[PDB]
Specification:
part of a larger assembly; 7 chains; A alpha+beta (121); B alpha+beta (151); C mainly alpha (128); D alpha+beta (92); E mainly alpha (51); F mainly beta (86); G alpha/beta (120); B: 151 residues; alpha+beta; three-stranded antiparallel sheet; globular; G: 120 residues; RNA-binding; ribosome; RNA modification
RNA sequence: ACCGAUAGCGAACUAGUACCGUGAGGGAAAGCUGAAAAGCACCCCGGGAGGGGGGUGAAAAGAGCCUGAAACCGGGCGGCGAUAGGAGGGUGCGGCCCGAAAGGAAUGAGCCUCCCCGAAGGAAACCGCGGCGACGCGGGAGUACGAGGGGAGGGGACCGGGGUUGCACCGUCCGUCUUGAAACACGGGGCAGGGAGUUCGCGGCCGUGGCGAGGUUAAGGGGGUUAAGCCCCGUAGCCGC
RNA sequence: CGGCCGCCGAGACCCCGGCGCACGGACCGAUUGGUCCGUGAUCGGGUAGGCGGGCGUGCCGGUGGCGUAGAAGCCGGGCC
């Protein structure tokens, strides 16, 4: 894992739960996909859970996210591939970052992910 | 032939039947199937019986050369394809039996698709004047029908 | 220079978007030309297309060629290279070349090629 | 812009074979002396004991292909390399 | 097709000269990693082996 | 925002220029008056709501008409139609 | 039809080398020999030891952009460079005491090509 | 280094067979299930042919059997559709519709705003003057604008492309003889397949290669080879001096 | 009719970017060549015809490969 913005190892099952969580969020509620859109979501505080791809390059476009999010105290999780992240988000192209602003049909799932990520770090 | 031109056939709400190599007129078969399409099965059977009995003319919209009109509104060229009606009535009864044995209710069946195609041509010759032998051919017809139970 | 590269890429995009489909005369009239669309030079003595009259289709000319610096490049700007196995996958330049897996390669070898290209950081135009 | 695509060593014959590509859009084919100077400067090779076997340009592509050799000592060159190549290089 | 005897002899000479080259033999496709040297000359003993 | 009428393309007897149109603003009847609108945009609204944009580049004739250049030329059903300046 | 030029890779390389050498040393003799070698094969220069004896002086350097043949008799001591030598011509030159070399050796010996005389 | 079922012998097969002419004689078309028939047991309808279920098979490939193009026909789907004129198309765009992949694109699409430089070209408000007048001259000013080349901000999913159709303008089909073709001059119902500068001898030239006052073999001979490939010899002969 | 003043109107004239061609030059290819550079107001229509380059098909000698995880062939799309 490149060390610029990776902080902790996210297990494969946790990544899969995050992927299906963002899938259900897109299906039912509302999400905000894209790096700039995610950054604005967290800066304004409308987001609840943020998901970051592990295959972003160059790194200067997504590196600032966890430093800027630890200020707002919002849960962030990692996923393996931006390709799969975008596919889950519903766009053919890759999605470096995603923010969920209302986890419709996913309140309990987001709570579980938040608890696990808080325990990890 | 074996296949059907219908796309979304399912064995729960539909029933199908066919006839191949019928010594009837494909043009009149097409004209009759045009009116038979989108009708209840019993109503279509009654319509075919009327056509056979010569009580109701079948309109012609595509192949109507040198055809006289008929009494009533919408006529216009019309005729009485008795042979075609008799041939297609058997297919209609066959599809009714298919639906009944499948478990559908005959009184609620609607003809949602019915089509006619030109089949193989049987060849022969007729002698003409000045030593010319000329084609003399029988055109066969394929008929396909699938009905659905409305609910 | 990336600046000239981008300018010429835009120029080629505009030119090839305005370029027409060069088809032989009366291609529409007969099915024998519709099913097999090509361009053939009109050579008849009275051919209006040969005479090059307004209101008639145009004919290919050397002027329509795209700028040299970006001729034959992918719309993304990379350079296509046809690949049939990992050996020739490895011989590309990730900063200036992209791999197109040959249509005749099976899935068994294609998955290997894709994972190797991911390891080597080489763009693939048809990643499946 | 020279990029090395392959380096091979053969001590049995006592030399190093270098396969590379020069990316020169908008520029002519680089001179042999310039290519040798750039390659020697980058690889820290000995200028007196290296030869450029060939430089090739293929159609409109600005990617020319170069093959070169670098020997440990002049004895191996005087034993292997032909006189015409030595004269062309000018190192003899 | 006909070729002069002297020209054929010169062509054979050139082919024999090229067979001992390093660049051309490798470029043809042969793999010569383990060959002691080019040309590869072997003692007369090789001519008596029939297995 | 001013109103104008799309009169025709820029044309000879039998030649048409698809990317230029002649526009008559409502209350201009001279070259002097029309020349004050040079550089202003012109918008045409499609029946489905799509908007096509051009700009005024020169004054046409002497009676106050102007020339508007459109990247996407008007379909031709805009002839005799209304457009908005600015 | 079109003039393809020599099919010999060695001859093409020699022509290119001669042009580069003329560029490097600022002389025209090598370019002249280059185009003279480039002329069509059916018109390639043909010279004889008789003509060399007729026109060349003792100790002079001679370049023949083509073939040198051994028709005649030779007395002069001349350094002759030619693309091809017939065995008779080479033997006659050696017996007379001259040297039968190539344009490559000629370039190496006299890079500026001063005093070299072209014979066709 | 021949053809691959309209090719190759006319015949890949019950082919000089069937068939035509009194006769001499002329003379076709026609190859392919599957690995194994495992070639559809049973049920309902039908006079029958066959249809619908259900089974066999990796796949019906179902015997009318490897693949299944085009022409042509029937149904569905999308577009137009009974006041509108041109060889059925060309340029530009607008409706309706499609739009996962291969094309760009959330590492930002159309889009909205702002800033800078800008080739050729290039206004007007207003001021003064000339002209009977249309109008022009000097300043404003080579200014606003200008193809294009760059930058910043907002939004967050389209754009490119495709089918049909509408509007404006333009456009009298293809090949051919002919001074002259839209021609009331000839060849042109549609689709598929076949189809027309080949070989030898002599001669004139050029592109290249070998040898060179010399060049070169022919018929043929020997060695070797699974083999007609490969190696050497062969000066009669021919051209030149 | 004798004149005059404005404005429209071509692929013509000017400008910006691109392609090729003819000629010259530099450098570079182991078979006709390749990259780039300089000039073109004095290069860019075309029938008969002459000349150069390129695209496609069967087979053979080599070289490098793909395929029952699906070859050739066939229908509809994207890109060059």
């Amino acid at each position: 894992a490149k060390p610029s913005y990776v902080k902790f190892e996210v297990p494969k099952e946790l990544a899969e739960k995050a992927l299906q969580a963002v899938e259900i969020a897109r299906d039912t509620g509302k999400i905000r996909k894209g790096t700039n859109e995610t950054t604005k979501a967290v800066e304004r505080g409308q987001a609840k859970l943020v998901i970051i791809a592990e295959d972003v390059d160059p790194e200067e476009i997504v590196a600032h996210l966890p430093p800027l999010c630890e200020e707002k105290e919002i849960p962030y999780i990692y996923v393996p591939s931006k390709k799969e992240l975008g596919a889950a988000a519903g766009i053919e192209v890759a999605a470096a970052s995603v923010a969920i602003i209302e986890p419709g049909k996913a309140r309990d799932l987001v709570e579980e992910i938040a608890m696990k990520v808080k325990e990890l770090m | 032939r074996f296949g059907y031109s219908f796309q979304n056939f399912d064995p729960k709400r539909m029933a199908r039947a066919s006839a191949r190599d019928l010594r009837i007129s494909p043009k009149l078969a097409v004209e009759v199937c045009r009116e038979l399409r989108g009708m209840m099965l019993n109503d279509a059977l009654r319509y075919l019986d009327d056509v056979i009995a010569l009580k109701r003319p079948v309109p012609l919209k595509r192949y109507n050369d040198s055809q006289g009109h008929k009494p009533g509104k919408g006529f216009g060229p019309g005729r009485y394809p008795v042979k075609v009606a008799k041939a297609i009535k058997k297919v209609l009864l066959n599809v009714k039996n298919n639906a009944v044995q499948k478990g559908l209710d005959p009184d609620k069946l609607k003809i949602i698709h019915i089509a006619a195609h030109k089949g193989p041509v049987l060849r022969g010759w007729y002698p003409r004047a000045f030593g010319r032998a000329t084609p003399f051919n029988e055109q066969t017809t394929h008929i396909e029908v699938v009905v659905e139970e409305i609910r | 220079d990336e600046k000239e590269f981008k300018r010429l890429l835009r120029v080629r995009a505009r030119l090839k978007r305005k370029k027409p489909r060069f088809l032989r005369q009366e291609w529409w009239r007969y099915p024998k030309f519709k099913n097999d669309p090509k361009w053939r030079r009109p050579k008849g003595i009275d051919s209006k297309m040969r005479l090059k009259l307004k209101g008639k289709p145009r004919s290919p000319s050397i002027g329509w060629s795209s700028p040299k610096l970006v001729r034959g490049l992918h719309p993304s700007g990379y350079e296509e290279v046809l690949v049939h196995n990992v050996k020739e996958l490895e011989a590309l330049d990730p900063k200036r070349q992209a791999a197109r897996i040959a249509h005749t390669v099976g899935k068994k070898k294609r998955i290997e090629i894709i994972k190797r290209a991911e390891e080597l950081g080489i763009k693939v135009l048809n990643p499946r | 812009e020279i990029r090395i695509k392959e380096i091979k060593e053969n001590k049995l014959i006592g030399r190093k074979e270098i396969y590379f590509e020069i990316y020169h859009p908008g520029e002519p084919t680089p001179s042999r002396k310039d290519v040798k100077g750039k390659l020697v400067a980058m690889l820290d090779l000995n200028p007196e004991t290296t030869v450029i076997q060939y430089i090739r340009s293929y159609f409109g592509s600005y990617i020319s292909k170069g093959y070169a050799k670098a020997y440990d000592s002049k004895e191996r060159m005087l034993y292997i390399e032909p006189e015409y190549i030595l004269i062309r290089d000018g190192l003899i | 097709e006909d070729i002069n005897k002297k020209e054929k002899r010169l062509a054979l000479m050139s082919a024999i000269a090229a067979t001992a080259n390093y660049d051309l033999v490798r470029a043809r496709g042969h793999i010569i990693d383990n060959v002691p040297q080019l040309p590869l000359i072997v003692v007369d003993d090789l001519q008596k082996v029939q297995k | 925002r001013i109103k104008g009428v799309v009169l025709s393309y820029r044309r000879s007897k039998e030649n048409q220029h698809n990317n230029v149109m002649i526009i008559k603003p409502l209350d201009v009847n001279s070259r002097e008056e029309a020349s004050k609108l040079i550089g202003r945009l012109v918008l045409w609204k499609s029946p489905s709501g799509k908007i096509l944009k051009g700009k005024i580049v020169r004054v046409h004739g002497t009676k106050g008409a102007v020339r508007a250049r459109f990247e996407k030329g008007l379909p031709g059903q805009a002839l005799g139609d209304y457009v908005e300046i600015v | 039809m079109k003039r393809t030029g020599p099919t010999d890779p060695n001859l093409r390389r020699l022509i290119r080398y001669l042009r580069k050498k003329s560029n490097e040393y600022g002389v025209k003799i090598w370019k002249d020999v280059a185009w003279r070698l480039e002329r069509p094969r059916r018109q390639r220069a043909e010279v004889n030891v008789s003509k060399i004896n007729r026109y060349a002086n003792d100790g002079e350097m001679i370049v023949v952009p083509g073939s040198v043949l051994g028709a005649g008799k030779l007395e002069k001591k001349v350094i002759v460079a030619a693309w091809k030598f017939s065995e008779t011509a080479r033997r006659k030159i050696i017996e007379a005491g001259g040297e039968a070399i190539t344009i490559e050796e000629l370039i190496e010996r006299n890079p500026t090509g001063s005093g070299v005389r072209i014979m066709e």
